[PDB]
Each structure stands twice: as C-alpha cells, then as structure tokens.
Design a protein around this ligand. Sequence first.
Ligand SMILES: [Zn+2]
Ligand SMILES: [Zn+2]
Ligand SMILES: [Zn+2]
Length: 92
Amino acid sequence: GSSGSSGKPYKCPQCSYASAIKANLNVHLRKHTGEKFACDYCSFTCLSKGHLKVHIERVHKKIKQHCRFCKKKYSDVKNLIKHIRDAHDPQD
Ligand SMILES: [Zn+2]
Ligand SMILES: [Zn+2]
Ligand SMILES: [Zn+2]
C-alpha cells in the first residue's frame, strides 16, 4: 500500500522538527527551552515575543476592551478607539 518506507514519524510540538527516534525528540525539545512567551488570553505559547502579539491580534482579535478612562467596555475595540478621540479628546 501507499505506506511503504516511512520515516521521521516523531514530530516536534514546538517546531517543524522531526526524527526517527523518541529520545532525539526529547533532547531536541531541550534546545527550544529558554524564552517562552505565553498568551495572556489562552494556554498559547511562543518563542518569539513579536509573534505572540500577533497571535492575539489574529486569535483574540476584537475582544471586549475596557476603556482605561471611563471603565467602559466595548464589544469591538475599533469603536473604543474612536470613543476616546471623541469623549476623551485631548487638547493636543
Ligand atoms: Zn523543535
Ligand atoms: Zn491566545
Ligand atoms: Zn472612555
């Protein structure tokens, strides 16, 4: 059948790494260790801080935002922005 000569079945849940041995997968994961930026919305994690931010702008995008000025929640942040410029419109 299709499945003939398979290899590198073990995949890394941290990156697109692979190996033909479990042990290897373990030692390989050790390298990933270090800086782990977890999401402040879900059980998500990333090595690149810059990326983590995007995860929220793509996953948790348009989340109930609470105005730090009038403690007013807004279904769509987009609006919250205009609001501040409307009600909380600065002199500058
Ligand atoms: Zn890896
Ligand atoms: Zn998240
Ligand atoms: Zn406000």
